[PDB]
Amino acid sequence: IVEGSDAEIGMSPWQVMLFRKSPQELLCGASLISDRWVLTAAHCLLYPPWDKNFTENDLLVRIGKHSRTRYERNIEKISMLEKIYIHPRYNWRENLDRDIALMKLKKPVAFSDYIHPVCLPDRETAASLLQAGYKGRVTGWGNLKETKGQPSVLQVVNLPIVERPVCKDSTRIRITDNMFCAGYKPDEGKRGDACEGDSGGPFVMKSPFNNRWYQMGIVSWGEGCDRDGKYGFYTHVFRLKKWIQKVIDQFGE
């Protein structure tokens, strides 16, 4: 996260760390959506140009974390994956369209002060909150600036959603309906962006209707981090909600 701040304890209890077994390394962020299921970005798992193709046994997820590096005893939970499901039409060749993946834990994880699932948006919640100027929140342990710059604890930044045609005109990459962008504009004075290692983490908004946190986006892509006139792009979770439900139903709640 560029230009964010340290998270408060328990601020984002759905935040998941995707951790490589060998060699040990932070891969990506992710989010807990039930006691068995974790949502992340497809490109965190599969990116053929870099020969990236992680399977279930290559990875672990770490849940309930605050410190980036320390084993947080009696706080974090470490789970192995039973299965990974990547969207069939994920588009690694061009713009990471449908940059979404689901991971099923081998065993259910117990909830606590530090571990708690986020909500997925319904139609009305998405229609209400996904509007230009409305801010969502992004969290992660990714780099503090465009490429050490590694944070010691979880970072958080609040960012305004941007109008589709501004997102459109800001980049030469083809934008689809399955993405939205966010961040401040050059003239807004404030700044901030997700950055490397934040991918697959959640973009969340707090609903004024029921005071629940909903995951509207998945940190997906950008051209560098925090450049003036550039914005961060997020997988549109509601647009993909049907596929998420299909997978969970078919492969076990």
Partner: peptide
């Protein structure tokens, strides 16, 4: 495999992997 104390095999000093999501288009790096 794991219980509580045996996580002394867990590194507390590790890198963050290169993230291709930030290297699209003008984000390219050498």
């Amino acid at each position: 495999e794991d219980y509580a104390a045996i996580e002394a095999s867990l590194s507390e000093t590790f890198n963050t992997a290169a993230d291709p999501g930030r290297r699209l288009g003008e984000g390219s790096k050498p």
